[PDB]
Fold The grappling hook protein A in the bacterium Aureispira sp. CCB-QB1.
Amino acid sequence: TTTLDATPPNSATGFWTTNSGATIANPNLANSAVYNLPTGTSTFYWTLSNGACIDFSVDSMVVEVTPASTDVADAGLDQNLCGQTSATLTAANPSTATGQWTQSASQAGQGIVITNPTNPNTTVTGLQQGNNYTFTWTLSNGNCTDYSTDMVQINVDVSPPDNAYAGVDILLCNQNTANLDAFVSQYGTGMWTSTSSATIIDPTLANTTVINLPQDTSVFVWTLSNGTCQNYSTDSVL
Amino acid sequence: TLTAANPSTATGQWTQSASQAGQGIVITNPTNPNTTVTGLQQGNNYTFTWTLSNGNCTDYSTDMVQINVDVSPPDNAYAGVDILLCNQNTANLDAFVSQYGTGMWTSTSSATIIDPTLANTTVINLPQDTSVFVWTLSNGTCQNYSTDSVL
């Protein structure tokens, strides 16, 4: 449903005609209403005449109708990377709509590049570690753009240089308890694990406490990790 | 399971912010007032909105349920080291201070405990015979995650 818009004549009488089923409520007015409108396009004609000077001058105007699409922006889920400079960033592939991946200019200016933006499932390159990247999926209809939006973030964690050190051989003669030690990593976190039965108090401390060490030697393992970097380094203490 | 009253003159659905949906939090069968939410992580907070609609008058009213998910921690209770008083009716207890939640001392015998929530609490009237103090760790809704004891 819409209205027409023609410029009224100075000294004549106007008239509208239609095509493809469109209906004009008042064909004699430059600003009349139109209620039947097919999808796609149709041409309306403005014919101007005066008295006996019939079909004197004409002009062409078109009305374009695009129905709402059923697809909505549907971006993939955020991800978490470790040491990568590239990733596939995803979205649902729409069928009644098209769209593209975009990013803020301030991030594009740092070298972050979206490959083939109009393809819903392409890679992003130039990602740096210790940072966060945001991509927006914008879906558009034929003539009704920015129909809907959604957004995927890439969190890129640092794959650190630190190695596990754990600590120094412990040796108990008459005691069933010990204080372990380890270098405290400056990246991420870490914890103690074991392959034998002993009770560990606060495994996430480098300085954890073993409260029931066996008679024979046991081994404690110090594992370092950082966010999505589930295991970057291990070593052990006897 | 996240719940709501089941309306009879109206229908509605559970929704969530896009920024939380993007982290993997999923509402099952949103139009059903009493369904589950999955993918919840510990140490976090989730918010769900119940939106009720009339036949042609949507967003008639709204309300909201929060899920607070506490961490079930790795720490064990350690409590402390056997105490032994020869001529003294008082002692300082000790315990590893948990890095998750809190904790406190309890007892099965008569002694007065000053500030039970300290690892380093004070016993001011220990009996003649041995007594036992119990160190219990807890975290928010995690009412009791670990216990051990000191003689």
